[PDB]
Amino acid sequence: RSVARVYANVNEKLGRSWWDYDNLVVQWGVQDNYEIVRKVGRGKYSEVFESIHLPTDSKCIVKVLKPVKKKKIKREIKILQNLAGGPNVVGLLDVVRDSQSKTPSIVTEYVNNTEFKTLYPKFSDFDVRYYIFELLKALDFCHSKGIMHRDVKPHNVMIDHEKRTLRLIDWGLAEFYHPGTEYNVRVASRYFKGPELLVDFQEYDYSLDMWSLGCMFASMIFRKEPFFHGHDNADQLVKIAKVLGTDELYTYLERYDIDLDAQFDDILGRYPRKPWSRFVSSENQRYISSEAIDFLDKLLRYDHQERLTAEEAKEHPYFEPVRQAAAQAS
Ligand SMILES: Nc1ncnc2c1ncn2[C@@H]1O[C@H](COP(=O)(O)OP(=O)(O)NP(=O)(O)O)[C@@H](O)[C@H]1O
Ligand SMILES: [Mg+2]
């Protein structure tokens, strides 16, 4: 059904030691070396707190995991250990657990983050090109290591704007890419789910992350959050269809031999492609460029195989200002 355009063989080249997270022995740190200070975040399967590594008296983040299954915890630790030292990936400090209840926690570095609703409007056209390019660097890295984030979204992209640093967090939905594996379609957030998730296509790959990157980016440059605002998973496909059109939806379904569920014929309707230029307004005009639109259009495609790769996106003309600045700076 589907094999990824790039990095399909990475898990085969790296060993079983690289992806067999079931057989992982965790060298737990000392729970009592960490003191929890204040709650800074929460998730469906987690609670997050700013904390102190007491021996060093240094700030960090402790994420208390509620296990869906023990195996899921091994996957997240395995992936963080594997991605260590990679550009703009959140740094893993420790894994610990309570001795009595055996509840685990992950200790990562603290990032001084501004809420995206507050931070995104403050950005210039250059900032967006720079921060999206920094995010590409992570996506490319972890894709090149045979890993899919599967929850790329603003909430899992911490940015310190004074430092001009970016870290991708929340690897709890990250899974290893094995060619032809049916993966679970109940991944990502509603507004960043890819068309493949919405139609229950299971043989997806690292391109899922690029569609979501495009939802994110479209949100920044059009100043609309979220860009695709479906009320449920069915409405989410309808909202995507009203922009991309259903002429290209049907050839994509036909191309991938997906029969749509019967619920959709009642609500899907018939829609023409809405051009990207109709989303341009006075408020979001600063972000708008002909490079930005072209770049967005090569992310937001029904067919995952037509999406730009993270490596390909970096060479896009939209980022050339970012590349030029970095070359001249050094
Ligand atoms: N390194 C960090 N620095 C600063 N804040 C962080 C850091 N890691 C996590 N947070 C905050 O904690 C929140 C929740 O973290 P996250 O790991 O996404 O939790 P979760 O339980 O997996 N939530 P969800 O994404 O909904 O599945 C984030 O949205 C951040 O605001
Ligand atoms: Mg999670």
Same domain, 39 and 145: no
Same domain, 115 and 126: yes
Same domain, 153 and 76: no
Please list the residues that pair with 109 across neighbouring strands.
Answer: 60
Same domain, 179 and 231: yes
Domain end, chosen from 89, 110, 131, is at 110
Same domain, 5 and 87: no
C-alpha span between 330 and 316 (Å, rounded): 21
Q: What CATH number did the domain enclosing 189 receive?
A: 1.10.510.10
End-to-end CA distance of the chain: 45
Same domain, 222 and 166: yes
Which of 242, 230, 217 minimizes the C-alpha distance to 120? 217
CB 181 within 8 A of CB 85: no
Structural domain boundaries, residue 279: 1-19+111-330
C-alpha span between 11 and 3 (Å, rounded): 13
DSSP secondary-structure letter at 150? S
Task: Please report, for residues 98, 127, 318, the alpha-carbon distance to residue 124 in angstroms, rounded to integers and kept in the order given.
Answer: 45, 5, 14
Cis ω before 104 (30° cut-off from 0): no
Which ranges of 70-175 would DSSP assign to H, the alpha helix? 70-82, 116-122, 125-144
Stated in angstroms to one decimal place, the resolution of this structure is: 2.4
Which of 222, 214, 264 minimizes the C-alpha distance to 241? 264
Same domain, 53 and 131: no
Q: State the DSSP H helix or E strand holding residue 104, giving kind and residue range, or none if neither.
A: strand 104-109
Q: What CATH number did the domain enclosing 94 receive?
A: 3.30.200.20
Q: Is residue 63 classed as helix, strand or coil in its secondary structure?
A: strand
Our count of domains for the chain comes to 2
C-alpha span between 2 and 305 (Å, rounded): 9
Instruction: Compute φ and ψ for 172, nearest 5 degrees.
Output: -70, -20
Tokens of 199: 């139609």
Q: Is residue 170 classed as helix, strand or coil in its secondary structure?
A: coil
* Count of Cβ atoms closer than 10 Å to residue 43 Cβ: 16
Domain end, chosen from 110, 145, 168, is at 110
Q: What is the C-alpha radius of gyration for the chain, rounded to an integer number of angstroms?
A: 20
Single-letter amino acid code for the residue at 320: E
Going from the Cα of 126 to the center of ligand 2, the distance in angstroms, rounded, reads: 30
Residue that has been written with the tokens 């023409």 in this structure: 272
Same domain, 47 and 175: no
Residue 296: Cβ-neighbour burial (10 angstroms; 0-12, 13-18, 19+): buried
CB 119 within 8 A of CB 159: yes
Angle at 166 between CA 162 and CA 170, to 5 degrees: 135
Please report the atom of ligand 1 found closest to the CA of residue 155. Answer: 29
> Assign residue 150 a region: left if phi > 0, alpha if psi is -120 to 50, beta otherwise?
left
C-alpha span between 133 and 105 (Å, rounded): 31
Same domain, 134 and 273: yes
Output the CA torsion sign for 174, 69, 195, 290.
negative
User: Does the annotation list 265 as a binding residue?
Assistant: no
Cα dihedral: 265, 306, 232, 262 (round 10): 20
Q: State the DSSP H helix or E strand holding residue 265, giving kind and residue range, or none if neither.
A: helix 263-268
Single-letter amino acid code for the residue at 17: S
Same domain, 40 and 12: no
Residue that has been written with the tokens 């990032």 in this structure: 111
Same domain, 220 and 289: yes
Tokens of 130: 């720079």
- In terms of DSSP bridges, do strands 92-97 and 104-109 run parallel, antiparallel, or are they unpaired? antiparallel
151 part of the active site: yes
CB 103 within 8 A of CB 63: no
User: Choosing from 127, 140, 151, 205, which is the catalytic residue?
Assistant: 151
Question: On the CB side of 173, how many CA atoms lie within 13 Å of its CA?
Answer: 23
CB 105 within 8 A of CB 97: yes
Single-letter amino acid code for the residue at 315: E
CB 62 within 8 A of CB 105: yes
Same domain, 147 and 37: no
Which of 227, 119, 210 minimizes the C-alpha distance to 163? 119
Tokens of 8: 């399909």
Domain end, chosen from 64, 84, 110, is at 110
C-alpha span between 320 and 131 (Å, rounded): 13
Ligand 1: which of 39, 42, 48, 64 to mutate, most ligand atoms within 8 Å of CB?
Answer: 48
Q: Is residue 50 classed as helix, strand or coil in its secondary structure?
A: strand
C-alpha span between 18 and 82 (Å, rounded): 7
